[PDB]
Amino acid sequence: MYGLVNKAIQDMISKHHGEDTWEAIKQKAGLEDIDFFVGMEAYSDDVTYHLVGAASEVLGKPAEELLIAFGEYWVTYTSEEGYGELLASAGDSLPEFMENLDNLHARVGLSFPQLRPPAFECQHTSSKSMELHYQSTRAGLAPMVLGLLHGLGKRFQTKVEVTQTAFRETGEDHDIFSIKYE
Amino acid sequence: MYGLVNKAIQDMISKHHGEDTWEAIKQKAGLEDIDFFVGMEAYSDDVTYHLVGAASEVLGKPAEELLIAFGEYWVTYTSEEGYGELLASAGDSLPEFMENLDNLHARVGLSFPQLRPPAFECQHTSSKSMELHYQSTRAGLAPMVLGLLHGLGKRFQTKVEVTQTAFRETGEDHDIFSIKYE
Ligand SMILES: O=C(O)CCCCN(CCc1ccccc1OCc1ccc(-c2ccc(Oc3ccccc3)cc2)cc1)Cc1ccc(C(=O)O)cc1
Numbered sequence: 001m002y003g004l005v006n007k008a009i010q011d012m013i014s015k016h017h018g019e020d021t022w023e024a025i026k027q028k029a030g031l032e033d034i035d036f037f038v039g040m041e042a043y044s045d046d047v048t049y050h051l052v053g054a055a056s057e058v059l060g061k062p063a064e065e066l067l068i069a070f071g072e073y074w075v076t077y078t079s080e081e082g083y084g085e086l087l088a089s090a091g092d093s094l095p096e097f098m099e100n101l102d103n104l105h106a107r108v109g110l111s112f113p114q115l116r117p118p119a120f121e122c123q124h125t126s127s128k129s130m131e132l133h134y135q136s137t138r139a140g141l142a143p144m145v146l147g148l149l150h151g152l153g154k155r156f157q158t159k160v161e162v163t164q165t166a167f168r169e170t171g172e173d174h175d176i177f178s179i180k181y182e
Numbered sequence: 183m184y185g186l187v188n189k190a191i192q193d194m195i196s197k198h199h200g201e202d203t204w205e206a207i208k209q210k211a212g213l214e215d216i217d218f219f220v221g222m223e224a225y226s227d228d229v230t231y232h233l234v235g236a237a238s239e240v241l242g243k244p245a246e247e248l249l250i251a252f253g254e255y256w257v258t259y260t261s262e263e264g265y266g267e268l269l270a271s272a273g274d275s276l277p278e279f280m281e282n283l284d285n286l287h288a289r290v291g292l293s294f295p296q297l298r299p300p301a302f303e304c305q306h307t308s309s310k311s312m313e314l315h316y317q318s319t320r321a322g323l324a325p326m327v328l329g330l331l332h333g334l335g336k337r338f339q340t341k342v343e344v345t346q347t348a349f350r351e352t353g354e355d356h357d358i359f360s361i362k363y364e
């Protein structure tokens with residue numbers, strides 16, 4: 001994933017737990033070698049998994065719980081590290097943001113085109129709910145999509161209730177969520 | 183489940199969608215030979231599952247979305263139909279209520295002893311966070327638990343984010359929810 005992602009992880013860990021524990025996690029992930037992540041440089045995904053795996057053990061916290069907190073962190077982080085305009089442009093509400101999300105990734109994709117953005121389809125079931133289809137080149141990131149959704153809820157002061165109803169991990173085509181909101 | 187569960191589904195659908203829709207759903211579930219549900223009578227679980235499945239078809243919403251809606255409704259419904267005091271006795275906050283739930287079900291299990299209550303274990307990860315282990319003799323009600331949690335937040339006027347972290351239906355031992363609450 002682009003370096004922005006690993007910079008975001010390094011940021012929330014060292015914000016919440018301390019620079020000491022971050023370098024610990026970094027050591028454990030076998031990533032003591034590299035000095036600082038480069039935001040616009042593409043990395044191989046393992047660097048992210050190993051950081052999340054390594055953070056799980058150092059913090060004695062389940063990985064999915066870390067992916068959840070990271071998903072939520074990402075929404076605020078990106079607003080403040082050069083992407084608040086791009087965020088604001090994806091829209092005014094949770095349903096609209098999700099509809100624009102493929103378009104937003106298309107924009108980001110142009111900037112540096114080694115981006116492999118996930119696909120999000122919405123089937124609105126009412127004025128207050130939807131079924132979200134999350135299609136990814138990457139495995140494991142459903143818990144992060146949950147956090148992302150609660151991040152957007154915070155962003156729009158919208159209460160969100162999300163339950164995962166299909167599971168890529170099992171061999172199903174793709175993750176699916178049912179969502180209810182304010 | 184005890185008939186109160188099916189009366190609550192009936193009430194919810196009737197209130198939200200009308201009695202014309204309720205009948206079609208009861209018809210669709212193939213339960214027209216049931217004139218009225220009896221609250222203190224133990225029914226086959228299948229009756230619940232069929233109403234949820236058939237309501238899903240009629241309303242054109244995923245079962246899991248209705249289960250969330252239903253979990254939220256249950257908190258209010260039981261408050262107003264004879265279990266207000268029982269509910270009150272289980273505490274003045276979300277962490278307390280959840281901690282008392284195993285005892286709330288003990289007292290429900292003298293009225294009547296054929297209750298199959300789920301077990302809820304809380305690991306409090308801070309004063310604003312819990313890991314909730316939900317263990318059930320039933321399948322597929324995790325989304326209802328999610329709704330129940332949001333119902334309690336409403337009840338105690340507390341902001342609450344629930345994220346499921348482990349899923350019984352994929353073959354994990356029991357559902358696990360991560361919960362932040364203000
Ligand atoms: O399943 C997957 O493959 C990844 C899932 C989680 C990742 N994000 C989640 C999307 C999301 C969902 C809800 C709410 C907000 C979301 O994202 C907002 C966002 C995401 C990415 C960027 C971004 C910005 C610059 C990037 O890199 C650049 C930019 C300019 C020039 C060079 C590189 C890369 C991503 C900005 C805002 C977005 C994302 C992040 C990284 C990549 C990637 O490296 O392929 C692809 C997508």
Ligand SMILES: O=C(O)CCCCN(CCc1ccccc1OCc1ccc(-c2ccc(Oc3ccccc3)cc2)cc1)Cc1ccc(C(=O)O)cc1
Pocket residue numbers: 183184186187221222223257260265268290293294296297298299300317318319320323326330331334
């Ligand atoms: O996993 C499962 O197997 C079921 C998940 C969802 C069900 N509820 C969840 C409990 C709950 C969770 C969060 C917040 C509040 C909750 O419950 C409040 C409550 C629950 C049940 C009753 C209740 C009252 C009367 C009952 O039945 C009677 C009453 C009098 C005489 C004879 C039967 C049964 C349940 C009242 C308040 C409660 C429940 C309802 C029915 C049964 C059962 O039929 O076995 C078991 C439990």
